[PDB]
C-alpha cells in the first residue's frame, strides 16, 4: 500500500498545484427556460498534461484530503470572473455554480463572492449557487446562515437533487430557496410513468405560488422535454438541450 499512497500523494500535490497555477478550468452547460434567461451551469475540469480531466478522476481524493472547500472557492471566483468578462462583452450571462456544505460556514467563500462581484461590477442576481438537498438536511443552521449572507447580495441559492417526500416539504418551511432542481430519480421516466408525473406536479404546484423556480436535469429526449413543460417545470438541461462545452455560444433567443 506504499505504491497506492504515493499515487494518492501525487494527486493531492497536483490538485494543490492546480489551485496555485490556474490548472482548473470551467466548462458550461446551457439551462433552458420552459417557463427566458442566458443561464449556464459551470462544470469543473482539470488540465493535467494534455487531458481535460473530469472530477470523477479526483474528487474522492479531494474530499479525503479536505480540498473541496478550496476547490469550490476557486470555481466560484472563476465563475464571477466569467460573468464579469461576459458582461463587459455585452452579454447578460447568469451562472449556476455548485458549492458543498463545508462552504456554508467558510468565511473565505462569502468574502470571495462579496469581493469578486464587486471588483467585476457584476450584480449578485447573475450568480446562482446550488447545493444538494441532502447536505442542507444535515447542516441546516449553517445553510440558513449562508442563505442569508449571500441573498443579501441578491444571489440565488437553491437545492439540487431535490426529492418529493414529506421531509422536503418540511425543509421548505425552514429554508426558502430561490430554486429547486429535481432529483433524477423522479424525472428519469417522466415521459412514460404516471407516478413520476405526479411527484413533479406535487412539487411545481407548491413551488409556483411560493415563488420558487423548478428545474429538471439529464433531459435526454423530446418526449421528456415535452412532459416537463406540461408539469410546469421552469427550466431544463441535459445533453438533448446541449452538452457541457468550453464556449458560451448557445442561442437562447
Ligand atoms: N449535473 C448534470 N450533469 C450532466 C447533465 N447532462 C450531462 N451531464 C454530465 O454528466 C455528468 C453528471 O455528473 P454529476 O452527477 O453532475 O456529478 C459531477 C459532480 O459530482 C462533480 N462536478 C462537476 N463539476 C463540478 C463543479 O463545478 N463543482 C463541484 N463541486 N463538483 C463538480 O463531478 C461529477 C462529474 O462531472 P462531469 O465530469 O462534468 O460530468 C457531468 C456532466 O458533464 C445534466 O443535465 N446535469
* Any atom of ligand 1 within 6 Å of the Cβ of 59: yes
Characterize 121-159 residue by residue with b for buried, 16 or more Cβ atoms within 10 angstroms of its Cβ, and e for exposed: ebebebbbbbbbbebbbebeebbeebbebbbeeebbbbb
* Any atom of ligand 1 within 6 Å of the Cβ of 56: yes
Say how many C-beta atoms besides its own lie within 10 A of residue 171's C-beta.
Answer: 20
Q: Are 179 and 214 in contact (CB under 8 A)?
A: yes
Q: Is 202 exposed, middle or buried (0-12, 13-18, 19+ CB in 10 A)?
A: middle
Distance CA(131)–CA(142), nearest Å, equals 12
> Which residues fall within 8 angstroms of residue 55, CB to CB, at 6 or more apart?
44, 46, 62
CA-based nearest residue to 160, from 118, 122, 131: 131
Say how many C-beta atoms besides its own lie within 10 A of residue 10's C-beta.
Answer: 11
* Any atom of ligand 1 within 6 Å of the Cβ of 44: yes
> Which residues fall within 8 angstroms of residue 235, CB to CB, at 6 or more apart?
31, 32, 33, 34, 39, 179, 213, 214, 215, 216
CA of 34 to the centre of ligand 1 (A): 22
Q: Are 251 and 55 in contact (CB under 8 A)?
A: no
> Which residues fall within 8 angstroms of residue 222, CB to CB, at 6 or more apart?
240
Q: Where does residue 133 fall: left (phi above 0), alpha (psi -120 to 50 degrees), or beta otherwise?
A: alpha
Distance CA(42)–CA(75), nearest Å, equals 8
Distance CA(57)–CA(245), nearest Å, equals 18
DSSP string, the chain: -HHHHHHHHHHHHHHHHHHHHT-EEEEEEE-EE-----EEEEEEEEEETTEEE-TTTTHHHHHHTT-HHHHHHHHHHHHHHHHHHHHHTT---EEEEE--GGGTT-HHHHHHHHHHHHHHT--GGGEEEEEEHHHHHHTHHHHHHHHHHHHTTT-EEEEEEE--SHHHHHHHHH---SEEEE-HHHHTTTTT-HHHHHHHHHHHHHHHHHT-EEEE----SHHHHHHHHHTT--EE-BTTTB--BS-------
The set of cell numbers assigned to 231 is 408539469
CA-based nearest residue to 128, from 153, 147, 155: 155
- Residue minimizing CA distance to atom 13 of ligand 1: 56
Pocket test for ligand 1, best of 15, 29, 30, 43 (most atoms within 8 A of CB): 43
Distance CA(179)–CA(156), nearest Å, equals 8
Candidate CATH numbers 3.40.50.360, 1.25.40.10, 3.40.50.2000, 3.20.20.450; the one for domain 1-253: 3.20.20.450
Q: Provide the residue count of the chain.
A: 253
Sign for the CA dihedral angle at 107, 113, 118, 120 comes to positive
Technique used? X-ray
- Residue minimizing CA distance to atom 33 of ligand 1: 55
* Any atom of ligand 1 within 6 Å of the Cβ of 57: no
Angle at 43 between CA 42 and CA 49, to 5 degrees: 135
Distance CA(215)–CA(188), nearest Å, equals 13
Distance CA(132)–CA(137), nearest Å, equals 9
Distance CA(140)–CA(75), nearest Å, equals 23
Pocket test for ligand 1, best of 34, 41, 55 (most atoms within 8 A of CB): 55
Q: Are 93 and 122 in contact (CB under 8 A)?
A: no
Amino acid at each position: 500500500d506504499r505504491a497506492e499512497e504515493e499515487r494518492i500523494e501525487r494527486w493531492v500535490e497536483q490538485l494543490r498545484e492546480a489551485l496555485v497555477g490556474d490548472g482548473f478550468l470551467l466548462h458550461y452547460q446551457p439551462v433552458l427556460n420552459l417557463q427566458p434567461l442566458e443561464l449556464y451551469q459551470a462544470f469543473l475540469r482539470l488540465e493535467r498534461n494534455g487531458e481535460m480531466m473530469s472530477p470523477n478522476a479526483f474528487m474522492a481524493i479531494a474530499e479525503e484530503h479536505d480540498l473541496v472547500t478550496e476547490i469550490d472557492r476557486w470555481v466560484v471566483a472563476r465563475a464571477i470572473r466569467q460573468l464579469g468578462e461576459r458582461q463587459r462583452a455585452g452579454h447578460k450571462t447568469h451562472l449556476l455554480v455548485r458549492i458543498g456544505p463545508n462552504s456554508f460556514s467558510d468565511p473565505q467563500m462569502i468574502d470571495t463572492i462579496r469581493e469578486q462581484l464587486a471588483v467585476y461590477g457584476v450584480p449578485g442576481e447573475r450568480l446562482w449557487l446550488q447545493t444538494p438537498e441532502s447536505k442542507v438536511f444535515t447542516h441546516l443552521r449553517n445553510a440558513q446562515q449562508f442563505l442569508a449572507a449571500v441573498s443579501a447580495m441578491d444571489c440565488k441559492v437553491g437545492l439540487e437533487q431535490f426529492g418529493s417526500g414529506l421531509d422536503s416539504f418540511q425543509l421548505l418551511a425552514h429554508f426558502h430557496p430561490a430554486f429547486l432542481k429535481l432529483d433524477r430519480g423522479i424525472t428519469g421516466d417522466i415521459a412514460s410513468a404516471r407516478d413520476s408525473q405526479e411527484k413533479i406536479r406535487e412539487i411545481t404546484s407548491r413551488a409556483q405560488p411560493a415563488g420558487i423556480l423548478t428545474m429538471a436535469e439529464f433531459v435526454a429526449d423530446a418526449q421528456s422535454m415535452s412532459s416537463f413543460f406540461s408539469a410546469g417545470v421552469d427550466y431544463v438541461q441535459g445533453d438533448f438541450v446541449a452538452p457541457t462545452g468550453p464556449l458560451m455560444n448557445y442561442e437562447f433567443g
